Amino acid sequence: RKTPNGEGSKTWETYEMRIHKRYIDLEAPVQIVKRITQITIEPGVDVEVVVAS
Amino acid sequence: TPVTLAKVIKVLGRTGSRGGVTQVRVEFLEDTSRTIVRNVKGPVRENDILVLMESEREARRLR
Amino acid sequence: AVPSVQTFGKKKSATAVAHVKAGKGLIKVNGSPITLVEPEILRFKVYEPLLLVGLDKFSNIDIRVRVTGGGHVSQVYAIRQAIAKGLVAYHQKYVDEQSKNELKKAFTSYDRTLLIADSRRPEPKKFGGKGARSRFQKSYR
Amino acid sequence: PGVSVRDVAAQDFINAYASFLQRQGKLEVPGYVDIVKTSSGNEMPPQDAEGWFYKRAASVARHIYMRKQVGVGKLNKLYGGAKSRGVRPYKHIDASGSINRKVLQALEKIGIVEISPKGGRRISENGQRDLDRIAAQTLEEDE
Amino acid sequence: IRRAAYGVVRYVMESGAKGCEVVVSGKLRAARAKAMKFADGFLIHSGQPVNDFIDT
Amino acid sequence: GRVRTKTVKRASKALIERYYPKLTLDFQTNKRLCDEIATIQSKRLRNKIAGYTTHLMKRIQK
Amino acid sequence: AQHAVILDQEKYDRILKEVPTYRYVSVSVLVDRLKIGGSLARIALRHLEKEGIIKPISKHSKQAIYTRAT
Amino acid sequence: ALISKKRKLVADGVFYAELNEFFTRELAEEGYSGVEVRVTPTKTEVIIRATRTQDV
Amino acid sequence: FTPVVLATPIPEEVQQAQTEIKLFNKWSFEEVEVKDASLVDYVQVRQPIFVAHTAGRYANKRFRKAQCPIIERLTNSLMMNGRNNGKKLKAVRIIKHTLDIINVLTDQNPIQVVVDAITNTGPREDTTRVARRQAVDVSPLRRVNQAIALLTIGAREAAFRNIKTIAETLAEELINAAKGSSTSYAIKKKDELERVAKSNR
RNA sequence: UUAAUUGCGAUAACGAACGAGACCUUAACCUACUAAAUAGUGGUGCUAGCAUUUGCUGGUUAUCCACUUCUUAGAGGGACUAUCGGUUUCAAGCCGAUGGAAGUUUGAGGCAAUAACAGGUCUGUGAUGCCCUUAGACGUUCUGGGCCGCACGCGCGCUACACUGACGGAGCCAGCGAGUCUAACCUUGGCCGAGAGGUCUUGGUAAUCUUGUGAAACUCCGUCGUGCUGGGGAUAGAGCAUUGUAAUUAUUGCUCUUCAACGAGGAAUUCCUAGUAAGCGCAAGUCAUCAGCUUGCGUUGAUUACGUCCCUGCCCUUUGUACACA
Q1: Which intervals hold domain Small ribosomal subunit protein uS7 (chain I) (predicted)?
Q2: Which among B46, C88, I115, I167 counts the fewest CB atoms within 10 Å?
Q3: Residue span of the structural domain in which B59 resides
């Protein structure tokens, strides 16, 4: 509800955050992952590796 | 039981306090060339037939 | 190397995916014959695409409809559309555009959802109401 | 010539499978029957009360057939209806557990339902046979 | 306030802005809330170009 | 309420007074002319501008 | 009782003369002849259909319609 | 870990909000124009967008 | 007529609908005509249909509900007194029943008798509050609108706290309206609106 | 003219800024691209049943092949009143038909000017001036009590006064959510139980599991037959559970019994123009427990306008004024 107190016409705020997820499946050896994961670091987009297949 | 069927030839705005009545001009299907002004209640397009229980009396706006 | 086309028809959150293939006359819905759809009056809404053109046009095809979402009525209208759109898409691709034209203006002459979904969608609910429009009762005094 | 459980109408099948499972005295009745209304949220017991049960048994057989594997929870939340909470708005309270559990056990002993992997219950091969046999008779009884 | 707020609105405008707005509300001149609004250039108010270019 | 505003009806007038040739009595071409020649921000603004240049080009040819 | 709705084996004889020569027959008509009330009206219709003085046109639950035998 | 991403982005979102308000309260006199949090392997880099750095 | 076979055996009564004619599955729109002018091009009996249920975009612009089949318009106006708002499946089942009812007694093909009930229960002159009353004529769309709104209101009010089910009541009302009776919350309720008219007409 | 100080224009006006529009999110179209074992599908294989000829209906998240119709989110495309006819000095526009997923600003929102109120909030704020107390505390801690107390009045609601119904069986389909690691979440599944609810495991930090949230109204078959009736379920009596340090002034749930008013509501007054009203339930917020509330979502889906100042107000111009806290 918009107002900090109770008084006023009953107006309502609907703040909506979005979260987008992506899904990559590589058939890499041990050689590449230790370079690809160490590079491609960006603010606001957090990446995790499931290196146990 | 003489009821007179008359097709409308033109609609002329709306009378009444509200737009409840529409002032329309009709041509009598029976013995045509006779054009008379008349009031309706419901929604009126053109070419629509109205059933008069009196062909005689004319129509005025509803101030 | 078989005539097979995967079509869909929908009415208000009701997805009906039809698979019209070269066959004999197996028209089936959720792995059951069309003759057994939940609402027994809307039996003649699911059926009308067949009665419009004729069962002779269905004497050389097999249709399998998979319905998901909506309610009972939404799902009947989805099947109806999915079957008609399936049949016209088959005739377009595997007969000719002549017989496609024929049964398109056969289907749209008798009025249609049937080929393209009713655009209508539910309006969202706004505060100070029980729906999209209907406001709560006002208390002056 | 390939008549299955799906090729026949819902009610017109369950009513003939109800006749069959009553002719056979094979399927049990838990003993508390006549004292239950198959819910937490109902008014009165099943009006038949002559072992309805032979209609539950039949419908849980036909449901578990059409589905992959059904648990008692899916049967409860399936069969459960709208509870009149008095002057308060109607709700969904799921149907009575024991009736749906003891009917699954009664099918398990008869050899219709099989305790299935992934939990829940599948149909037995004898189950499919008996269901399809009745399903064929139901149609050809009219024809 | 009229010196400080005009001093900073003139800095902002010279720095290379399309417009600036300074609003100073509060008990100005012996106990009565008064809004003194010092502005130069063009300030939009409606739509997303508020979220785009305007800082608050 | 299909009245065009000054923001499109001025842009249109500037556009026709410059590229009277390279404008052909057709929205579907005039749309792509505006894509190439102008730097319009919104896709829908283009469609309105181009649709009114076409309206002016039809009226200028009577 | 409640306006002539009583169980009887003689109003069986009253029924099986009065019901024929009706252009329309249903629960509503049977009761509005101040006869058998509802529960008894329905089982009367079912027995008249077995006997074959009734032709069922539609037999929907809650509204069963019937006609005189051709 | 294990904390749901649905929640975890909001969790480190609130971290940013508490950081912004901590530096907006403390380092507001040496100028301040916001913070940035870059999440790295074995490192989370918080960078202060403030004015005179000889005192920041 | 040409009983075709498929891998899905269709019943012959359904197979006698393919381009033969579109009925309910028994009520024909060949037609025993509207017969009363002024309401032709305002009652749809020209486009035949299987059920009294379309999705329907008929409350779109203005006059589109004049080109809706009149059976749906009854089916629609039977859902009022809002314990039955929505629920068109119940309404069409009631319509199916009342049609085969007004068949079994006084057959006459139970669509033209429904049409004739619309032509007779239409108030053909009314008044307006201009505490005065000025008599005006009635638009043929409103003559249909109120003919339906008198028949279907009369029906529910009769069937309320009764044994006679909405099907039989609506049926009786449509019959006595068709054959001008004044005994069905009908011509009586219309004459009451043309009586207050002739006072000022 | 317009939804519009939106425009065509006329012009001591000329050239500008804000607001409207534009913009943004969203809901619809994409047999087109880009990919999908966290979505599906058609194939083969290991097979189950009915048939026997090929054919039907299923199972297999660790048997392989293929694509993208369905589903998901990326970059985009499409609509601009497009074309035609009318129609106004043939100017902005408006009306009708056709095509199209879409022809009301395409539907719905978000954002939203200048000026103003002595509108609400010092009980949201380590937001704060002043004033009051500062320990026998007006600080915050503990025990219990009260915010719920009942001659009476008023406002939002829920349930109903039934046969378009209730009840019993069967039939049986959504959409938007949310969900636990040093914590007790969403909780399948099997057993115990008439219940409510217990137990022993289980999947899920989540398009993988709950979950197809197989929701309710609704559909069909049958039992009630115009009666305060089996409509209605209020009050009360006793018992069994769950949450909680704590259930008494009954938390809630469940079982049996008790059955009240209420037969559609006076003068008045509210909201509503299409997937809208209305019926129906569902998920989320507070939440240990408690929704008759709200925020959202779908399910079923009308009648009646497509208008006008009569009432109640609005915007611009003219006009009268002894009003200007108007």
Answers
A1: 50-201
A2: B46
A3: 1-63
- Looking at the 3D structure of chain B, how many domains does it have? 1
Residue indicated by tokens 């729906």 = C131
Question: What is the extent of the structural domain holding D6?
Answer: 1-143
Give C37-40's long-range contacts (Cβ < 8 A, gap of 24+): C37/C76, C37/C79, C38/C72, C38/C75, C38/C76, C39/C72, C39/C73, C39/C76, C39/I89
Distance (Å, whole) CA D104 – CA D112? 9
Determination approach: cryo-EM
Q: How far apart are CA I128 and CA I201, in angstroms?
A: 12
Residue H2 in any domain: the answer is: no
Provide the residue ranges of all domains of chain C, joining segments of one domain with +. Answer: 1-141
How far apart are alpha carbons E46 and E44 in whole angstroms? Answer: 6
CA distance C83 to C14: 14
Separation of CA I65 from chain center: 13
Q: Name the 3-class secondary structure at C9.
A: strand
Who's near I73: CB < 8 A, 6+ residues apart?
Answer: I65, I144, I148
Task: Indicate the resolution in Å.
Answer: 2.9
Largest CA distance in chain B: 34
- List chain J nucleotides near protein: any atom < 7 Å from a Cβ: 1-4, 6-8, 17-29, 31, 36, 38, 41-42, 48-52, 55-61, 69-71, 73-74, 77-83, 91-94, 96, 101-116, 118-121, 123-125, 154-160, 162-175, 178-181, 188-197, 205-207, 211-212, 214-227, 231-234, 253-256, 264, 269-282, 291-310
For chain H, the domain total comes to 1
| Residue in C34, C53, C55 closest to I15 by CB | C55
Which structural domain, as residue segments, surrounds residue H22? 7-56
Of G27, G38, G65, the CB nearest to I101: G65
